Amino acid sequence: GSHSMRYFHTSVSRPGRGEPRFISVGYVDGTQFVRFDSDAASPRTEPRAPWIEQEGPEYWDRNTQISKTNTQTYRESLRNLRGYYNQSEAGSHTLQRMYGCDVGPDGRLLRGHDQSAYDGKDYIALNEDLSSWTAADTAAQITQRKWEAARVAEQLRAYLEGTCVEWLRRHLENGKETLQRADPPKTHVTHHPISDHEATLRCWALGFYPAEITLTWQRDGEDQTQDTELVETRPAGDRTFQKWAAVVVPSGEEQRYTCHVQHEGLPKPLTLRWEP
């Protein structure tokens, strides 16, 4: 199927408690493979998945250098952003960047991504053309003009279409036994009486990878969108994910309800009912 490589940068100022912490994590789809933390006793890009461990010293040294430079650049960016919003030196602020590329089943580039946020709100983003910017406000227009003058977008296009995709394809091959393996959900329906006239039906999906899944309830073949309680898909800690969907049903009407499951790992979509 399709795949992505994404890096997630978070820098957080903490006035009075030293300089802003910088964290970078890298993912291939839902699998983290590297981390860097400027607050670690000895900051270094570290492996977080077994398949990346084979990379040689140059990979670890170069990514550590990029991260150490980023720790400093993001602090300069936070100082600039504070001024662009006329903010006091007393408050804490956050700068985030997420960037990377997507490829299809043939390994060809689908699109690149580069987006940034300040205090959790969209600030500036590279457009899908990898050539122009979208700035959220007059502060981001200052960044945009600065990056336009230095032709940053052309540099980002070259990275996203070159290095980005070359390394995503390399990771997909080195980790193919996991990264290109879809594990289907293990499913079951539970029944929990609430009162004499209603019960909860809960549809479970466990042990699946990747996280994308469709889990719905139907009543007489009609989707129960508004009436379904659907928890966020959550990590189990063994690379897999979990999710459930529940509906409150009238006593005796359980057989009118069907749970539908769609996932890449399944040979066919599932239709489940409560089995007393």
Partner: peptide
Amino acid sequence: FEDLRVLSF
């Protein structure tokens, strides 16, 4: 490899 942007915001 990661990208490297040396120019601040």
